[PDB]
Amino acid sequence: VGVGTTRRRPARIFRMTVGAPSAEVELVINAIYCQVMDV
Amino acid sequence: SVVTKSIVNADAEARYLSPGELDRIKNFVSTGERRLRIAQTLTENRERIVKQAGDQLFQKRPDVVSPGGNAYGEEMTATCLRDLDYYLRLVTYGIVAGDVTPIEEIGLVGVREMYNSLGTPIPAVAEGIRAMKNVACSLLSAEDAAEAGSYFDFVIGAMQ
Amino acid sequence: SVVTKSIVNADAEARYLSPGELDRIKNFVSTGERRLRIAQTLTENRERIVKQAGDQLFQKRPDVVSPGGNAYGEEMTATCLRDLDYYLRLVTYGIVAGDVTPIEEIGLVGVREMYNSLGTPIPAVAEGIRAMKNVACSLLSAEDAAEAGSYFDFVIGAMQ
Amino acid sequence: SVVTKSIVNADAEARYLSPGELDRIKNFVSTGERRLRIAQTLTENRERIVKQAGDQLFQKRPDVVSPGGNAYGEEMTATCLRDLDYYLRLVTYGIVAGDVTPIEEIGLVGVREMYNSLGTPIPAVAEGIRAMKNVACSLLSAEDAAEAGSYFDFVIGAMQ
Amino acid sequence: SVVTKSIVNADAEARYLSPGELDRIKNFVSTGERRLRIAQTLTENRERIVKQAGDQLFQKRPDVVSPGGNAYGEEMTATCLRDLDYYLRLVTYGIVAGDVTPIEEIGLVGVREMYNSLGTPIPAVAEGIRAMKNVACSLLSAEDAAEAGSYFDFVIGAMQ
Amino acid sequence: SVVTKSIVNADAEARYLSPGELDRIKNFVSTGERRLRIAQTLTENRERIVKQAGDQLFQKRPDVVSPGGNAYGEEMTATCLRDLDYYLRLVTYGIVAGDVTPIEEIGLVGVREMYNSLGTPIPAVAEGIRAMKNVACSLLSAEDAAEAGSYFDFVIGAMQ
Amino acid sequence: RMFKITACVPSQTRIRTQRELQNTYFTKLVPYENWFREQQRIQKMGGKIVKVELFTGKP
Amino acid sequence: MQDAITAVINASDVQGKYLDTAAMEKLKAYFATGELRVRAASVISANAANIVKEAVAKSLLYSDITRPGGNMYTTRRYAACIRDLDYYLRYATYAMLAGDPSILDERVLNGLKETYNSLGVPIAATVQAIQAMKEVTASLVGADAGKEMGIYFDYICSGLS
Amino acid sequence: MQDAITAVINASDVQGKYLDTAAMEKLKAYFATGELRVRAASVISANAANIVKEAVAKSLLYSDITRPGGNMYTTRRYAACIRDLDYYLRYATYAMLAGDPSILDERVLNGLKETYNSLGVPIAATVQAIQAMKEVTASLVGADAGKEMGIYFDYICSGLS
Amino acid sequence: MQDAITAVINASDVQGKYLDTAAMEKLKAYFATGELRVRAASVISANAANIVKEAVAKSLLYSDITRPGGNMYTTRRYAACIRDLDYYLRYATYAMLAGDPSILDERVLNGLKETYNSLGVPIAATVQAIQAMKEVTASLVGADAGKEMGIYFDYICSGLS
Amino acid sequence: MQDAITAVINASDVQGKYLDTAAMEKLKAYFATGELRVRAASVISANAANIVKEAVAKSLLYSDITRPGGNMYTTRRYAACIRDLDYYLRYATYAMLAGDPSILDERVLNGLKETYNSLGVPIAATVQAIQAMKEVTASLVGADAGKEMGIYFDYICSGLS
Amino acid sequence: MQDAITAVINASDVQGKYLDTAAMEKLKAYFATGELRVRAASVISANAANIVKEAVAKSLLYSDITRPGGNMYTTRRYAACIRDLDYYLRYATYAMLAGDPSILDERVLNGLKETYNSLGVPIAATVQAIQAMKEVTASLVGADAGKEMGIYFDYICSGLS
Ligand SMILES: CCC1=C(C)/C(=C/C2=NC(=C\c3[nH]c(/C=C4\NC(=O)[C@H](C)[C@H]4CC)c(C)c3CCC(=O)O)/C(CCC(=O)O)=C2C)NC1=O
Ligand SMILES: CCC1=C(C)/C(=C/C2=NC(=C\c3[nH]c(/C=C4\NC(=O)[C@H](C)[C@H]4CC)c(C)c3CCC(=O)O)/C(CCC(=O)O)=C2C)NC1=O
Ligand SMILES: CCC1=C(C)/C(=C/C2=NC(=C\c3[nH]c(/C=C4\NC(=O)[C@H](C)[C@H]4CC)c(C)c3CCC(=O)O)/C(CCC(=O)O)=C2C)NC1=O
Ligand SMILES: CCC1=C(C)/C(=C/C2=NC(=C\c3[nH]c(/C=C4\NC(=O)[C@H](C)[C@H]4CC)c(C)c3CCC(=O)O)/C(CCC(=O)O)=C2C)NC1=O
Ligand SMILES: CCC1=C(C)/C(=C/C2=NC(=C\c3[nH]c(/C=C4\NC(=O)[C@H](C)[C@H]4CC)c(C)c3CCC(=O)O)/C(CCC(=O)O)=C2C)NC1=O
Ligand SMILES: CCC1=C(C)/C(=C/C2=NC(=C\c3[nH]c(/C=C4\NC(=O)[C@H](C)[C@H]4CC)c(C)c3CCC(=O)O)/C(CCC(=O)O)=C2C)NC1=O
Ligand SMILES: CCC1=C(C)/C(=C/C2=NC(=C\c3[nH]c(/C=C4\NC(=O)[C@H](C)[C@H]4CC)c(C)c3CCC(=O)O)/C(CCC(=O)O)=C2C)NC1=O
Ligand SMILES: CCC1=C(C)/C(=C/C2=NC(=C\c3[nH]c(/C=C4\NC(=O)[C@H](C)[C@H]4CC)c(C)c3CCC(=O)O)/C(CCC(=O)O)=C2C)NC1=O
């Protein structure tokens, strides 16, 4: 019985930060809605 | 591009490009000529594909093609076909790039708003994309058709 | 795996796997056999590879193994060889995986903190991995050395 | 300074310092003469302490002065002495302030990053700081050595 | 305690206790015997001081004692005096602790809301506290009165 | 205005004004004539109502008018009356507007702090406002008194 | 009514590995009530207030 | 932000006297006109999407701006262009209902011309399209409502400036 | 999350031994399955919306659940039901490609049953819908792909119930 | 921020030199005045509210600024006027006790002039109120304490400039 | 909040009584032993890194815990383990300075056992590591101070088990 | 951001026409250079610490900047200088992989001059250091990689303004 590396390893998440104007800006926008509001 | 997407992820992580990510870019370099050849074929047969797919789309959605639809009259149908041609050119650009992000910037952003402003039916646009996929399968090799079909499938989702 | 990294990106994007991402997964499927063969070679020559690497690392920085050094004494030198062997096994896992995902979760997250606590020199550990890279290139085929060298190089950069 | 830390707390509170906070200010005012006297001793014997501490550090960690160490050669060793002198003068400034905050602002923030990039061993630098503290204990009165030892120990902990 | 408040700040900053904070604790312990002697003197003379201060407060604010004031009638005046006595005991506890935190926990947190609910005049209560402070300063020895004055001044500021 | 407040809510929704909200605005348009006539009557009797309310307030709080009170002295009483009249004029403006929010923005925001700076009792100011409300109800018609009572109730809440 | 304020705060306490230039120098718009707390917070951080301007027409 | 009645109240507050009889007369006239304005505004809200489409057809349809590189020749650009026109219409509707264009100038026109100039969007061309939309909207709404629509369109012309 | 290759690597790390022959053939099984997996994933993405529509039509449409008071008898409720089904389908497609149920356990099936219970949405109704979606997906993907997709979807349905 | 000792240390750090006897004399002056400054600062804290009230009356007692249209002629405006002066007094008291004015300039003066210019509030009127506060604080605290309070108030006047 | 002196004050506050002789004696004892506690706490902070290194060497290292599959096999787990010991020591020394075991229960021991159980940390191994720290800390601090530190360390262990 | 392929796509989109044969030849040249660029980027990551060390030593070691009052005479400033230099090297390396400097200019060169002006750092001294780093990087990577790296570093030098 040996615990594998997945022993509370993956709780973290991708971090969304603003930047230069691109279509990815709406991905950041989506993230803001997705987290501040619980969609 | 594929390099653009991978570099975007790496820049967010603030890490130099990972070995696997670099390998992905190297694979893009290896298959660049084949991707360009497929794109050149699409551009070469662009007009014929447009005509055949237009006939199939009109058959699928007769009401739009007929008067009393969005493509009511020759002029309205021609404008609709011109918009479809712009879609096809964007699809060729995306297939050459290997990443659907350029196509998404060209057409996917606010696509629902544009279709609503025109009044035209989004499902019929999607059906036209499917007809283009069948024509592309006819005019491409089996390996080429699969990749082109994948990009076209992203286009179908964009139509929805 | 490379598929695992792509899945993580897709989950963040809240979208099905991109066509290009699936293409890289297909490339990983194709290269599974070659990667497994390279990993088998490393595992087969495991003892000699890290033995030569240990001699090279101790030659490059004799204070690791000298009196007053972190690994002074036979038992601590064997423990140093074990740490190198842990890294070698992780590199073999990563070569099979086709991505940095296996190594990053084991030996590339917080490794600086752990080594600082015990007292072992991080720069000397990095040099030891470099010595392993040279030995592996000697013991592998030219393009096998390139891929294995890439995974090794990510490990070395992580130590920095 | 003690006044500076009190000012920070007061800035957040937007309220006048409580009687206990004022008592802390009064204690610093009462011991200002003691702090100046201790600083007088340290500054007067500063150069001798630096040279003695250099001898002690080289004895305890000869690897630093050994071939391949950072302080190999007269120029590098002189740079080591200058760095130790900068730390000692910073300690004197902090002792005069009465709080480790002035020393922390001047240095020891990012010191790990800077020294590790330079290539000198952080543990060896910490050992030199410890030798300086021992020399100060020998050269100063016990009551002054208590305060001076405390500020020295804060520097040692930051180095760790 | 003052040491307790410093420990709270240190825990929030996620750092071991600062040398200055430790010095604050040492000074408080050294002065603790005098602090408790002053506190015991205040407790011993608490009743007489309470009576004198109550007379002075009524003289300064006759309307409050008179009908149409919060302390209208003997019973209302008695409840007013009881609240003052509880505040005096809390002030003694704060002086003994060497920090205003014990007094702040007991009262002055939401005290304005309590006064608004009851209708009792906050400025008159503050003046009564000031009268008690003057009488207590006269009653205590000069060194003890100096500390007691600071604690009482903090209470007066909370009242205002 | 009430329509303006509804417009602000509609702007936050980023949608055109709600059907019920527009109907309420139309009702306000009809009610404007009654509001104007009632306001004209209130303005005509404003001075007399102010004098009567001042006498009632002096009866309620003789101590405030007397020495040792906020209105002690002719000058202090005159400033008190000016504040009461300014609040009455603001109340008339708010009633004419039909929006309690405009009156709250102009005054009664932080009014407790303003009264604290002046030294006047908020409860005594409230009692004066209540006397003015009773006089205004008598001066106005029964329908006008009902609206005036609502505005006075908002003023009473601000006073408390 | 809101104010367009631009201020630059040095990140002395945390030498952030992730890109922090945007946070180091920024231009933002804050409500008039928000401006009191935001100016105090920027002062607490120690950043210099490059500019204060009023987007609203009337002072 | 200021209502029409609130603006009269603000003037009286600055004066330090109760609202004048002439100001009260202006408020009463505003209420009387507001009833008709409100009915027309409800009509405008119901046909807002149709009005936007008509203006876009009048100018944007079959235009060089629609042709590639015309600053509206993208899916994102087209969505933004239509959205900006609709937002201008909504803010103008609020201004017409209030009787004061101060709110529209305060938020919608606050640096909008400068931002559009930085973006490169043609402010004058958009203003011409907005004027055509204003004419059509005024015709549908009526003459009295067209007068209010004219005030909102004048604010739009100032925004073009 | 985990993959087939990643899970074998985890097991080897637990054991503390370099790649064995057993490890080699487990990994090789994943390598062989990759072609089937990726082809099926492309098909699933292409017909994803149609899959949801077919599943609810086969199971919950034209039923009391759709009729008033059935937890799906609102526009918002119906949209939410379709959304949750799409969430399960997307994570299941991920997990099918990955080869391991760790993704479904970590994200899809975390607290879902308790939240569904407190809301009052029927776990049994969701399970029936998931099985219907599995049937539609197997038909679209193909026989070999349907077997794997069945395993992953089975994990989601079993965890929900 | 800075203190007297901290400012001397900053100058010494820029110089790079060991502690100087002249710097020790300056620090000794700070230590010698610190005890009296601490007692005076406690007095200022005790009577802070009364000092603010007296200064507010001196500058604004039946003032035209209080009268309608005077920019302090609102409940919110009057409260804000009180609040700013109170904050300035507290920060100035801390600066006077510290013996260094740089912290006061950075925390309070930085951006204050720009904000006051945008608001349109009269800097000179605030400076007159600040001078009245300095006079009242000097009277309550004493002449020796008033000298330190005067230095802090002079820095406040410079910030108004 | 709870400290030794503060807890005596809090009990007296609940009674409402003025300071008793017994309360004065207990507070005097806290004042009396503060000197030894303070000096030892400074020593602990100075040699904190060496203490956790010694503790893991004496208890948690060169065993199955750090060998594969032992919950420390990976660098992430090892870093968290030494970090956890460091936090244990830091809050323990906080509490040792305070003199009251209540502080550690408020922060260190609030849900700690449940968290460790959920993550799979060996409770016994953590307890033995804490005991090893107790030996090392006693050696550095000295017997008189270490005995006081040992009581609060042991309270942490009791909370864990 | 932007890449070489993305730039070709942007030109084609502005044209509104399918890719020309000459444009395709430009894309083919990018594909040809990609292999060397990718290997060079991997080499840069492996020797990144060595590159930073050598460049920093050549630029400012044993200099007035290191000496007291030289603005790199604090440990925090020294670390921050290394951090800024490493960020410059890394972002430029990613741009070198892309083959297009637009991403580097947008991400790193926007507002950098204003921020450095506020910081007081010598942009010209940083430019000399970056040029020295370009020389060292060219030496380590090789001639072909050095030429592209030099062009990107020249773009960084232009952004230093
Ligand atoms: C680069 C991305 C992009 C696209 C794609 C785009 C499309 C686009 N489609 C338009 C209209 C239109 N689009 C359609 C579309 C259709 N009607 C049908 O019956 C079919 C189902 C369907 C296509 C097969 C029609 C009919 C119009 C004219 C609207 C009308 O006048 O009734 C117009 C307005 C007229 C014009 O071109 O000036 C644009 C700009 N604009 C863009 O910037
Ligand atoms: C309480 C709110 C609420 C609504 C409104 C609602 C509507 C609703 N409409 C449905 C079907 C449908 N709705 C339509 C609608 C139309 N087809 C047309 O040609 C017209 C343009 C249009 C109506 C005028 C059609 C055709 C179906 C059947 C779809 C099918 O199964 O093929 C269904 C699925 C079948 C079912 O009931 O199980 C629902 C749930 N459900 C709700 O909970
Ligand atoms: C871990 C991933 C995850 C899950 C599983 C999840 C489920 C989830 N489902 C919810 C509600 C809901 N879910 C349904 C779904 C259904 N209606 C039906 O008829 C079917 C039997 C069924 C599925 C097909 C409905 C109707 C609601 C309530 C919607 C409402 O009335 O507001 C809610 C409450 C918030 C809301 O209303 O959306 C959550 C959080 N959220 C998550 O983040
Ligand atoms: C337009 C909104 C508005 C209001 C209302 C307002 C009130 C206001 N009331 C004041 C004073 C005062 N207010 C009172 C009030 C009272 N004393 C009593 O005994 C009564 C219970 C009560 C009145 C019914 C008194 C006595 C003063 C003078 C106090 C002094 O300054 O010495 C002052 C200070 C002196 C001055 O005017 O400069 C202001 C500004 N300011 C405003 O901008
Ligand atoms: C670090 C301490 C600090 C300062 C100094 C500061 C300045 C400051 N003063 C303000 C407002 C204000 N300040 C005043 C002050 C005055 N009006 C007068 O007639 C007098 C001459 C004068 C007082 C002596 C007024 C009236 C406002 C409100 C402006 C308005 O809306 O009309 C505001 C706007 C936000 C608010 O309502 O607080 C700021 C930010 N902010 C701060 O955090
Ligand atoms: C999966 C990630 C991972 C790794 C790699 C790992 C290694 C590891 N190396 C250790 C020790 C050590 N590591 C070294 C390392 C070195 N000394 C030198 O001179 C060289 C420069 C260098 C290696 C080449 C030494 C000397 C020790 C023993 C320390 C001692 O007991 O004095 C220890 C502590 C003793 C023990 O095994 O209990 C661990 C856990 N643990 C992990 O969880
Ligand atoms: C005011 C705070 C502060 C400090 C402390 C500081 C340190 C500092 N140490 C340096 C170098 C150095 N530091 C060391 C340090 C050591 N080598 C050893 O063997 C010992 C263990 C140890 C000292 C006891 C060495 C050897 C160098 C020279 C590196 C080289 O030239 O290759 C340098 C670069 C050369 C120069 O001074 O120009 C700086 C700036 N800078 C600062 O602003
Ligand atoms: C997108 C990549 C990126 C860059 C380039 C960047 C620049 C940058 N450099 C900074 C600091 C700094 N940069 C330096 C740099 C130098 N001092 C010297 O003597 C040298 C000539 C030079 C280095 C070559 C210094 C000293 C500071 C600290 C200034 C301070 O707050 O005191 C800061 C302030 C915040 C911080 O501490 O990080 C930024 C934002 N930020 C970024 O996100």
Q: What is the DSSP letter of F61?
A: -
CB burial string D62-87: b at 16+ within 10 A, e below: ebbbeeebbbeeeeebebbbebbbbb
**Which residues of H lie closer than 8 Å to F, measured between beta carbons?**
1-6, 9, 12-13, 17-19, 24, 27-28, 31-32, 34-35, 38, 41-42, 44-45, 48, 90-91, 93-94, 97-98, 103
Residue given tokens 């997906």 in the structure block: I137
Distant-in-sequence, close-in-space partners of J154: CB < 8 Å, separation ≥ 6: none
Instruction: Say if ligand 6 is within 6 A of residue K61 CB.
Output: yes
Neighbours of K115 (CB within 10 A): 11
Pocket, ligand 2, Cβ cutoff 6 A: I 61-62, 66, 73-75, 78
The resolution, in Å, is 3.7
Contact of J93 with J145, CB cutoff 8 Å: no
Q: Which fold has domain H1-161?
A: Globin-like (1.10.490)
Residue L17's alpha-carbon distances to F2, H62, L12, L13, in angstroms, are 56, 18, 6, 7
Measure in Å the smallest separation between the Cα of C16 and chain I Cα atoms. Answer: 7
CA of C98 to the centre of ligand 3 (A): 38
Instruction: Say if ligand 3 is within 6 A of residue I43 CB.
Output: no
- Chain A positions touching B109 (Cβ under 8 A) are 23, 26
User: Residue B95 has which token pair?
Assistant: 């297939």
Instruction: Say if ligand 7 is within 6 A of residue L61 CB.
Output: yes
Distant-in-sequence, close-in-space partners of D76: CB < 8 Å, separation ≥ 6: D70
CA of A34 to the centre of ligand 3 (A): 16
Instruction: Say if ligand 7 is within 6 A of residue D126 CB.
Output: no
Exp. method: cryo-EM
Nearest ligand 3 atom to alpha carbon I107: 1
Across the interface, of E2, E20, E150, the residue whose CB is closest to D99 is: E20
**Nearest-10 Cα torsion for C35, C38, C43, C47:** -150
Nearest ligand 2 atom to alpha carbon I60: 38
Contact of H75 with B114, CB cutoff 8 Å: yes
Which chain D residue is nearest to residue L57, measuring alpha carbons?
D118
Distance CA D124, CA K78 (A): 24
The angle subtended at Cα I93 by Cα I91 and Cα I94, nearest 5°, is 60
Distance CA J81, CA J67 (A): 14
Q: Identify the burial level of L151 via C-beta atoms within 10 angstroms of its C-beta, where 0-12 means exposed, 13-18 middle and 19 or more buried.
A: middle
User: Which residues of E are annotated binding-site positions for (2R,3E)-phycocyanobilin?
Assistant: 80
Nearest ligand 6 atom to alpha carbon K60: 38
Tell me which H or E stretch contains G2: strand G2-8
CA of L47 to the centre of ligand 7 (A): 22
Q: What are G49's strand-pairing partners?
A: G7
User: Which residues of J are annotated binding-site positions for (2R,3E)-phycocyanobilin?
Assistant: 81
Pocket, ligand 5, Cβ cutoff 6 A: G 35-36, 39-40, 43; J 65, 71-72, 77, 80-81, 84-85, 87-88, 107-108, 112, 115, 119, 121-122, 125-126, 129
Contact of L85 with L133, CB cutoff 8 Å: yes
Neighbours of L117 (CB within 10 A): 12
Distance CA E132, CA E130 (A): 5
Instruction: Say if ligand 6 is within 6 A of residue K70 CB.
Output: no
User: Which residues of C are annotated binding-site positions?
Assistant: 80
Distance CA J160, CA J113 (A): 6
Strand ranges across the sheet with G25-31: G25-31, G2-8, G48-54
Tell me which H or E stretch contains G49: strand G48-54
Distance CA F148, CA F96 (A): 10
Measure in Å the smallest separation between the Cα of B63 and chain L Cα atoms. Answer: 30
Q: What's the CATH code of the domain at E52? A: 1.10.490.20
3-state secondary structure of B32: helix
Distance CA J4, CA J97 (A): 10
Chains that touch J (3 or more CB pairs under 8 A): D, E, F, G, H, L
Contact of J26 with J128, CB cutoff 8 Å: no
Q: Do chains C and E touch (3 or more CB pairs under 8 A)?
A: no
Q: If we measure between CA atoms, which residue out of L11, D128, H4 comes closest to residue F96? A: H4
Residues K67, K68, K72, K76, CA torsion sign: positive
Contact I42 B160 (CB under 8 A): no
Which ligand places an atom closest to the C-alpha of I82?
3
Q: Where are the domains of chain J?
A: 1-161
Residue given tokens 């050269």 in the structure block: D139
Distant-in-sequence, close-in-space partners of D119: CB < 8 Å, separation ≥ 6: C123, D70, L53
Mutate to test the interface with J, among F88, F117, F129, F154 (most CBs of J within 10 A): F117
Instruction: Say if ligand 6 is within 6 A of residue K30 CB.
Output: no
The protein residue whose alpha carbon is closest to atom 19 in ligand 8 is L72
Which chain E residue is nearest to residue J52, measuring alpha carbons?
E160
**Nearest-10 Cα torsion for B54, B59, B62, B67:** 50
Q: Does A12 touch chain B (CB under 8 A)?
A: no
Residue E64's alpha-carbon distances to E60, E61, E125, in angstroms, are 9, 6, 10
Distance CA J128, CA J133 (A): 9
Contact C105 A30 (CB under 8 A): no
**Nearest-10 Cα torsion for D5, D93, L65, D47:** -160
Contact of L34 with B28, CB cutoff 8 Å: yes
Question: Is position I157 annotated in a ligand binding site?
Answer: no
Instruction: Say if ligand 1 is within 6 A of residue B77 CB.
Output: no
Chains that touch L (3 or more CB pairs under 8 A): A, B, C, D, G, H, J
Residue C10's alpha-carbon distances to A30, B7, B19, E97, in angstroms, are 14, 16, 20, 59
Which chain K residue is nearest to residue I17, measuring alpha carbons?
K68
Which ligand places an atom closest to the C-alpha of K62?
6
Please report the DSSP string for chain J in residue order: ---HHHHHHHHHHHHTPPPPHHHHHHHHHHHHHHHHHHHHHHHHHHTHHHHHHHHHHHH-SS-TTTSTTSSS-SHHHHHHHHHHHHHHHHHHHHHHHHT--HHHIIIIITTHHHHHHHHT--HHHHHHHHHHHHHHHHHHH-HHHHHHHHHHHHHHHHHH-
Contact C18 B100 (CB under 8 A): yes
Contact G43 J117 (CB under 8 A): no
Distant-in-sequence, close-in-space partners of L143: CB < 8 Å, separation ≥ 6: none
The protein residue whose alpha carbon is closest to atom 34 in ligand 6 is K61
> For chain F, what is the domain count?
1
User: Residue H53 has which token pair?
Assistant: 């489409």
**Nearest-10 Cα torsion for F30, F31, F37, F40:** -130
- Chain J positions touching H16 (Cβ under 8 A) are 67-69
The protein residue whose alpha carbon is closest to atom 38 in ligand 6 is K62
Q: Does K69 touch chain I (CB under 8 A)?
A: yes
Which chain G residue is nearest to residue D110, measuring alpha carbons?
G15
Q: Tally DSSP H helices, then E strands, for chain E.
A: 10, 0
Domain of residue E135: give its range.
1-160
Contact of L19 with B10, CB cutoff 8 Å: no
Distance CA B83, CA I21 (A): 57
Q: At what angle do helices E74-97 and E142-159 cross, to 10 degrees?
A: 120
The protein residue whose alpha carbon is closest to atom 9 in ligand 3 is I116
Mutate to test the interface with C, among B16, B18, B21, B91 (most CBs of C within 10 A): B18
Q: What is the DSSP letter of B106?
A: I
Which chain J residue is nearest to residue F105, measuring alpha carbons?
J76
